[PDB]
Design a binder for this molecule. Structure first.
Ligand SMILES: CCCCCCCCCCC[C@@H](O)CC(=O)O[C@@H]1[C@@H](N)[C@@H](OP(=O)(O)OP(=O)(O)OC[C@H]2O[C@@H](n3ccc(=O)[nH]c3=O)[C@H](O)[C@@H]2O)O[C@H](CO)[C@H]1O
Ligand SMILES: [Zn+2]
Length: 300
Protein backbone atom coordinates (compact mmCIF):
# COMPACT_ATOMS: atom_id res chain seq x y z
CA UNK A 1 0.00 0.00 0.00
CA UNK A 2 1.18 3.52 -1.04
CA UNK A 3 1.04 5.30 2.32
CA UNK A 4 0.00 8.81 3.32
CA UNK A 5 2.79 11.14 4.38
CA UNK A 6 3.23 13.61 7.28
CA UNK A 7 6.20 15.34 9.00
CA UNK A 8 8.39 13.60 11.59
CA UNK A 9 8.86 16.81 13.65
CA UNK A 10 7.42 20.35 14.13
CA UNK A 11 9.34 23.02 12.12
CA UNK A 12 9.30 26.84 12.03
CA UNK A 13 10.19 29.61 9.58
CA UNK A 14 9.78 33.32 10.38
CA UNK A 15 9.73 35.96 7.65
CA UNK A 16 7.64 38.79 6.26
CA UNK A 17 4.34 38.63 4.41
CA UNK A 18 4.76 39.98 0.89
CA UNK A 19 1.69 42.28 1.05
CA UNK A 20 1.42 43.23 4.82
CA UNK A 21 5.17 43.60 5.34
CA UNK A 22 4.56 42.40 8.95
CA UNK A 23 6.42 39.48 10.62
CA UNK A 24 4.82 36.04 10.09
CA UNK A 25 5.72 32.83 11.90
CA UNK A 26 4.96 29.68 9.84
CA UNK A 27 4.66 26.52 12.00
CA UNK A 28 4.39 23.18 10.13
CA UNK A 29 2.99 20.39 12.34
CA UNK A 30 2.71 16.56 11.87
CA UNK A 31 -0.87 15.42 11.62
CA UNK A 32 -2.32 11.86 11.75
CA UNK A 33 -3.84 9.85 8.83
CA UNK A 34 -6.93 11.29 7.09
CA UNK A 35 -6.76 14.73 8.59
CA UNK A 36 -5.82 16.42 5.35
CA UNK A 37 -4.03 19.70 4.71
CA UNK A 38 -5.10 22.30 7.36
CA UNK A 39 -4.24 26.03 7.36
CA UNK A 40 -4.57 27.59 10.82
CA UNK A 41 -4.62 31.16 12.04
CA UNK A 42 -3.14 31.00 15.48
CA UNK A 43 -3.26 34.82 16.08
CA UNK A 44 -7.01 34.49 16.63
CA UNK A 45 -8.96 33.39 19.69
CA UNK A 46 -10.23 30.85 19.05
CA UNK A 47 -7.79 29.89 16.20
CA UNK A 48 -9.32 29.65 12.68
CA UNK A 49 -8.87 26.51 10.54
CA UNK A 50 -9.09 26.25 6.70
CA UNK A 51 -9.24 22.75 5.13
CA UNK A 52 -7.55 22.58 1.73
CA UNK A 53 -10.59 23.15 -0.50
CA UNK A 54 -10.65 24.67 -4.03
CA UNK A 55 -13.78 26.64 -3.08
CA UNK A 56 -11.90 28.57 -0.25
CA UNK A 57 -9.86 30.43 -2.91
CA UNK A 58 -11.97 33.59 -3.05
CA UNK A 59 -9.49 36.38 -3.96
CA UNK A 60 -6.99 35.78 -6.82
CA UNK A 61 -6.01 39.41 -7.34
CA UNK A 62 -2.37 39.25 -6.12
CA UNK A 63 -1.91 35.65 -5.04
CA UNK A 64 -4.07 32.62 -4.09
CA UNK A 65 -5.90 33.87 -1.06
CA UNK A 66 -8.08 31.65 1.10
CA UNK A 67 -11.12 33.42 2.70
CA UNK A 68 -13.80 31.88 4.99
CA UNK A 69 -17.42 33.06 5.71
CA UNK A 70 -16.31 35.78 8.19
CA UNK A 71 -13.58 37.31 5.98
CA UNK A 72 -10.77 35.58 7.87
CA UNK A 73 -7.86 35.23 5.33
CA UNK A 74 -4.71 33.23 4.53
CA UNK A 75 -2.87 34.49 1.48
CA UNK A 76 0.26 33.57 -0.59
CA UNK A 77 -0.41 29.82 -0.01
CA UNK A 78 0.88 28.74 -3.54
CA UNK A 79 4.64 28.58 -2.90
CA UNK A 80 4.26 26.47 0.23
CA UNK A 81 1.58 24.34 -1.54
CA UNK A 82 4.10 23.60 -4.39
CA UNK A 83 6.55 22.20 -1.78
CA UNK A 84 3.74 20.10 -0.21
CA UNK A 85 2.60 18.77 -3.66
CA UNK A 86 6.21 18.16 -4.75
CA UNK A 87 6.92 16.01 -1.66
CA UNK A 88 3.42 14.48 -1.48
CA UNK A 89 2.49 15.69 2.03
CA UNK A 90 -1.15 14.67 2.71
CA UNK A 91 -1.51 15.39 6.41
CA UNK A 92 -0.22 18.62 7.89
CA UNK A 93 -1.33 21.55 10.07
CA UNK A 94 0.06 24.76 8.49
CA UNK A 95 -0.08 27.41 11.27
CA UNK A 96 0.35 31.17 10.79
CA UNK A 97 0.02 34.09 13.21
CA UNK A 98 -0.43 36.61 10.29
CA UNK A 99 -2.98 36.75 7.42
CA UNK A 100 -0.28 35.30 5.08
CA UNK A 101 2.50 32.71 4.51
CA UNK A 102 6.02 34.41 4.73
CA UNK A 103 7.47 35.17 1.28
CA UNK A 104 10.92 33.76 2.19
CA UNK A 105 13.04 34.06 -1.05
CA UNK A 106 9.97 34.19 -3.34
CA UNK A 107 10.23 30.50 -4.40
CA UNK A 108 9.16 27.06 -3.05
CA UNK A 109 12.81 25.97 -2.25
CA UNK A 110 12.83 27.34 1.43
CA UNK A 111 9.64 25.32 2.10
CA UNK A 112 11.20 22.15 0.56
CA UNK A 113 14.29 22.50 2.92
CA UNK A 114 11.87 23.01 5.80
CA UNK A 115 9.91 19.79 4.92
CA UNK A 116 13.21 17.88 4.56
CA UNK A 117 14.64 19.27 7.91
CA UNK A 118 11.37 17.98 9.53
CA UNK A 119 11.57 14.60 7.77
CA UNK A 120 8.76 12.85 5.81
CA UNK A 121 6.84 10.20 7.78
CA UNK A 122 4.61 7.43 6.32
CA UNK A 123 1.26 6.61 8.04
CA UNK A 124 -0.66 3.29 8.05
CA UNK A 125 -3.29 4.60 5.55
CA UNK A 126 -3.58 4.65 1.75
CA UNK A 127 -2.79 7.88 -0.06
CA UNK A 128 -5.74 9.27 -2.08
CA UNK A 129 -5.06 10.82 -5.56
CA UNK A 130 -7.43 12.74 -7.85
CA UNK A 131 -7.41 10.89 -11.19
CA UNK A 132 -8.63 12.97 -14.21
CA UNK A 133 -10.92 10.78 -16.34
CA UNK A 134 -12.09 13.35 -18.98
CA UNK A 135 -10.62 16.44 -20.71
CA UNK A 136 -11.66 19.73 -18.94
CA UNK A 137 -10.74 23.15 -20.32
CA UNK A 138 -11.34 26.71 -18.96
CA UNK A 139 -10.87 30.01 -20.81
CA UNK A 140 -10.50 33.68 -19.95
CA UNK A 141 -10.21 35.57 -23.22
CA UNK A 142 -6.97 34.52 -24.98
CA UNK A 143 -5.81 32.55 -21.86
CA UNK A 144 -6.78 28.91 -21.24
CA UNK A 145 -5.84 25.96 -18.98
CA UNK A 146 -6.61 22.28 -19.40
CA UNK A 147 -6.47 18.90 -17.77
CA UNK A 148 -6.45 15.66 -19.80
CA UNK A 149 -6.29 11.98 -18.60
CA UNK A 150 -2.59 10.84 -18.22
CA UNK A 151 -0.81 8.04 -16.21
CA UNK A 152 1.37 10.24 -14.05
CA UNK A 153 1.55 14.03 -13.90
CA UNK A 154 2.88 16.48 -16.46
CA UNK A 155 2.77 20.23 -16.98
CA UNK A 156 3.16 22.18 -20.22
CA UNK A 157 2.96 25.95 -19.63
CA UNK A 158 3.20 28.84 -22.10
CA UNK A 159 3.73 32.52 -21.14
CA UNK A 160 3.45 35.47 -23.53
CA UNK A 161 5.11 38.60 -22.25
CA UNK A 162 5.70 41.54 -24.57
CA UNK A 163 8.58 42.56 -22.22
CA UNK A 164 12.26 42.92 -23.35
CA UNK A 165 13.54 40.98 -20.26
CA UNK A 166 10.98 38.05 -20.26
CA UNK A 167 10.67 37.47 -24.08
CA UNK A 168 14.55 37.25 -24.19
CA UNK A 169 14.07 33.94 -22.31
CA UNK A 170 12.26 30.68 -23.24
CA UNK A 171 8.49 31.18 -22.68
CA UNK A 172 7.29 27.53 -22.88
CA UNK A 173 8.27 24.92 -20.32
CA UNK A 174 7.17 21.28 -20.14
CA UNK A 175 8.01 18.62 -17.58
CA UNK A 176 7.12 15.14 -16.38
CA UNK A 177 6.56 15.77 -12.71
CA UNK A 178 8.28 13.88 -9.90
CA UNK A 179 9.56 14.90 -6.46
CA UNK A 180 13.11 15.01 -8.00
CA UNK A 181 12.20 16.91 -11.19
CA UNK A 182 10.20 19.46 -9.12
CA UNK A 183 13.12 20.07 -6.61
CA UNK A 184 15.76 20.34 -9.38
CA UNK A 185 13.87 22.19 -12.15
CA UNK A 186 11.07 24.16 -10.48
CA UNK A 187 11.23 24.67 -6.65
CA UNK A 188 13.95 27.42 -6.83
CA UNK A 189 12.20 29.58 -9.47
CA UNK A 190 11.23 32.97 -7.89
CA UNK A 191 8.20 35.21 -8.34
CA UNK A 192 8.58 38.35 -10.50
CA UNK A 193 7.31 41.91 -10.37
CA UNK A 194 7.37 44.98 -12.62
CA UNK A 195 8.51 48.17 -10.84
CA UNK A 196 5.44 49.99 -12.30
CA UNK A 197 3.09 47.52 -10.52
CA UNK A 198 5.05 47.44 -7.22
CA UNK A 199 5.04 51.24 -6.91
CA UNK A 200 1.24 51.38 -7.54
CA UNK A 201 0.52 48.57 -4.95
CA UNK A 202 2.88 50.14 -2.38
CA UNK A 203 1.15 53.60 -2.33
CA UNK A 204 -2.15 51.70 -1.72
CA UNK A 205 -0.67 49.80 1.25
CA UNK A 206 0.09 46.47 -0.57
CA UNK A 207 3.47 44.70 -1.28
CA UNK A 208 5.03 46.21 1.85
CA UNK A 209 7.24 43.13 2.41
CA UNK A 210 8.66 43.24 -1.10
CA UNK A 211 12.38 43.50 -1.82
CA UNK A 212 15.05 42.01 -4.16
CA UNK A 213 15.56 39.32 -1.47
CA UNK A 214 12.08 37.96 -2.25
CA UNK A 215 11.49 38.46 -6.05
CA UNK A 216 12.76 39.10 -9.56
CA UNK A 217 12.19 42.86 -9.92
CA UNK A 218 11.93 44.11 -13.52
CA UNK A 219 11.85 47.66 -14.88
CA UNK A 220 10.55 48.49 -18.38
CA UNK A 221 13.67 46.98 -19.93
CA UNK A 222 15.68 44.66 -17.66
CA UNK A 223 16.01 42.46 -14.55
CA UNK A 224 17.19 44.80 -11.72
CA UNK A 225 18.49 42.00 -9.44
CA UNK A 226 22.30 42.26 -9.11
CA UNK A 227 22.92 38.49 -9.37
CA UNK A 228 20.30 38.12 -12.15
CA UNK A 229 18.22 35.00 -12.73
CA UNK A 230 18.71 31.50 -11.21
CA UNK A 231 17.54 30.12 -14.64
CA UNK A 232 17.40 31.53 -18.17
CA UNK A 233 13.60 30.92 -18.11
CA UNK A 234 12.96 31.46 -14.37
CA UNK A 235 9.79 33.36 -15.34
CA UNK A 236 8.05 30.34 -16.99
CA UNK A 237 9.49 27.89 -14.33
CA UNK A 238 7.77 30.03 -11.59
CA UNK A 239 4.42 30.17 -13.48
CA UNK A 240 4.54 26.35 -13.54
CA UNK A 241 5.44 26.39 -9.75
CA UNK A 242 2.31 28.58 -9.03
CA UNK A 243 0.14 26.08 -11.11
CA UNK A 244 1.53 23.13 -9.05
CA UNK A 245 0.82 25.10 -5.86
CA UNK A 246 -2.68 26.21 -6.93
CA UNK A 247 -3.76 22.80 -8.16
CA UNK A 248 -2.76 21.43 -4.70
CA UNK A 249 -5.71 23.39 -3.21
CA UNK A 250 -7.75 20.17 -3.36
CA UNK A 251 -5.10 18.82 -0.92
CA UNK A 252 -4.34 15.63 -2.95
CA UNK A 253 -1.88 14.85 -5.75
CA UNK A 254 -3.44 14.79 -9.23
CA UNK A 255 -2.96 11.96 -11.84
CA UNK A 256 -3.39 13.73 -15.22
CA UNK A 257 -1.91 16.08 -17.81
CA UNK A 258 -1.99 19.89 -17.26
CA UNK A 259 -1.64 22.39 -20.18
CA UNK A 260 -1.78 26.22 -20.00
CA UNK A 261 -1.43 29.38 -22.00
CA UNK A 262 -1.19 32.66 -19.99
CA UNK A 263 -2.72 31.01 -16.86
CA UNK A 264 -2.54 32.51 -13.34
CA UNK A 265 -3.99 32.15 -9.85
CA UNK A 266 -7.50 32.91 -11.09
CA UNK A 267 -7.47 30.50 -14.08
CA UNK A 268 -5.61 27.70 -12.15
CA UNK A 269 -8.38 27.82 -9.53
CA UNK A 270 -11.04 27.98 -12.30
CA UNK A 271 -9.82 24.72 -13.90
CA UNK A 272 -9.37 23.02 -10.51
CA UNK A 273 -12.98 23.97 -9.55
CA UNK A 274 -14.28 23.12 -13.07
CA UNK A 275 -12.70 19.59 -12.94
CA UNK A 276 -13.91 18.97 -9.37
CA UNK A 277 -17.52 20.12 -10.15
CA UNK A 278 -17.78 17.69 -13.12
CA UNK A 279 -18.46 14.47 -11.18
CA UNK A 280 -17.45 12.23 -14.24
CA UNK A 281 -14.17 14.04 -15.05
CA UNK A 282 -12.34 12.70 -11.97
CA UNK A 283 -12.24 9.98 -9.24
CA UNK A 284 -10.30 9.28 -6.03
CA UNK A 285 -7.70 6.49 -6.46
CA UNK A 286 -5.62 4.51 -3.95
CA UNK A 287 -2.87 2.01 -4.62
CA UNK A 288 -3.16 -1.05 -2.37
CA UNK A 289 -0.61 -2.63 -4.81
CA UNK A 290 2.61 -0.47 -4.95
CA UNK A 291 3.33 -1.78 -8.51
CA UNK A 292 0.37 0.20 -9.95
CA UNK A 293 1.71 3.65 -8.98
CA UNK A 294 2.82 5.70 -12.02
CA UNK A 295 6.58 6.54 -12.20
CA UNK A 296 5.76 10.30 -11.59
CA UNK A 297 4.91 9.47 -7.95
CA UNK A 298 8.22 7.56 -7.16
CA UNK A 299 9.92 8.37 -3.78
CA UNK A 300 12.23 11.49 -3.66
C1 LIG B 1 13.38 49.81 -2.90
C2 LIG B 1 12.60 48.52 -2.77
C3 LIG B 1 11.67 48.33 -3.96
C4 LIG B 1 11.82 46.95 -4.58
C5 LIG B 1 10.76 46.04 -4.01
C6 LIG B 1 10.16 45.16 -5.08
C7 LIG B 1 9.15 44.21 -4.47
C8 LIG B 1 8.92 42.94 -5.26
C9 LIG B 1 7.53 42.41 -5.01
C10 LIG B 1 6.91 41.78 -6.25
C11 LIG B 1 5.52 41.28 -5.93
C12 LIG B 1 4.84 40.66 -7.13
O1 LIG B 1 4.63 39.29 -6.84
C13 LIG B 1 3.48 41.31 -7.30
C14 LIG B 1 2.70 40.83 -8.50
O2 LIG B 1 1.72 41.45 -8.89
O3 LIG B 1 3.20 39.68 -9.07
C15 LIG B 1 2.35 39.15 -10.11
C16 LIG B 1 1.87 37.79 -9.64
N1 LIG B 1 0.90 38.00 -8.58
C17 LIG B 1 1.29 36.92 -10.76
O4 LIG B 1 -0.11 37.17 -10.99
P1 LIG B 1 -1.10 35.96 -11.49
O5 LIG B 1 -0.29 34.54 -11.40
O6 LIG B 1 -2.48 35.91 -10.89
O7 LIG B 1 -1.11 36.19 -13.09
P2 LIG B 1 -2.18 37.01 -13.99
O8 LIG B 1 -2.28 36.00 -15.27
O9 LIG B 1 -3.47 37.26 -13.24
O10 LIG B 1 -1.26 38.28 -14.47
C18 LIG B 1 -1.83 39.58 -14.59
C19 LIG B 1 -1.59 40.16 -15.98
O11 LIG B 1 -0.45 39.57 -16.62
C20 LIG B 1 -0.81 39.12 -17.94
N2 LIG B 1 -0.10 37.89 -18.33
C21 LIG B 1 -0.29 36.76 -17.57
C22 LIG B 1 0.28 35.57 -17.80
C23 LIG B 1 1.20 35.51 -18.96
O12 LIG B 1 1.75 34.46 -19.22
N3 LIG B 1 1.36 36.66 -19.69
C24 LIG B 1 0.76 37.88 -19.43
O13 LIG B 1 1.00 38.85 -20.15
C25 LIG B 1 -2.33 39.03 -17.97
O14 LIG B 1 -2.89 39.36 -19.25
C26 LIG B 1 -2.81 39.94 -16.86
O15 LIG B 1 -3.27 41.20 -17.34
O16 LIG B 1 2.13 36.93 -11.93
C27 LIG B 1 2.26 38.25 -12.47
C28 LIG B 1 2.88 38.16 -13.84
O17 LIG B 1 2.07 37.31 -14.64
C29 LIG B 1 3.01 39.16 -11.50
O18 LIG B 1 2.93 40.49 -12.02
ZN1 LIG C 1 4.40 32.53 -7.32
Amino acid sequence: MIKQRTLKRIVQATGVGLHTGKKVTLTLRPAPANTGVIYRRTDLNPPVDFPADAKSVRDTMLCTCLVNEHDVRISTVEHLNAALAGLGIDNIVIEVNAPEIPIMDGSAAPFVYLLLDAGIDELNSAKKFVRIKETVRVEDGDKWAEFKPYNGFSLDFTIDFNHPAIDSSNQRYAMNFSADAFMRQISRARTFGFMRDIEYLQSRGLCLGGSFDCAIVVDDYRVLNEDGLRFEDEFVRHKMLDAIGDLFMCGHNIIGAFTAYKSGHALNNKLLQAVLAKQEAWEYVTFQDDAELPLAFKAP
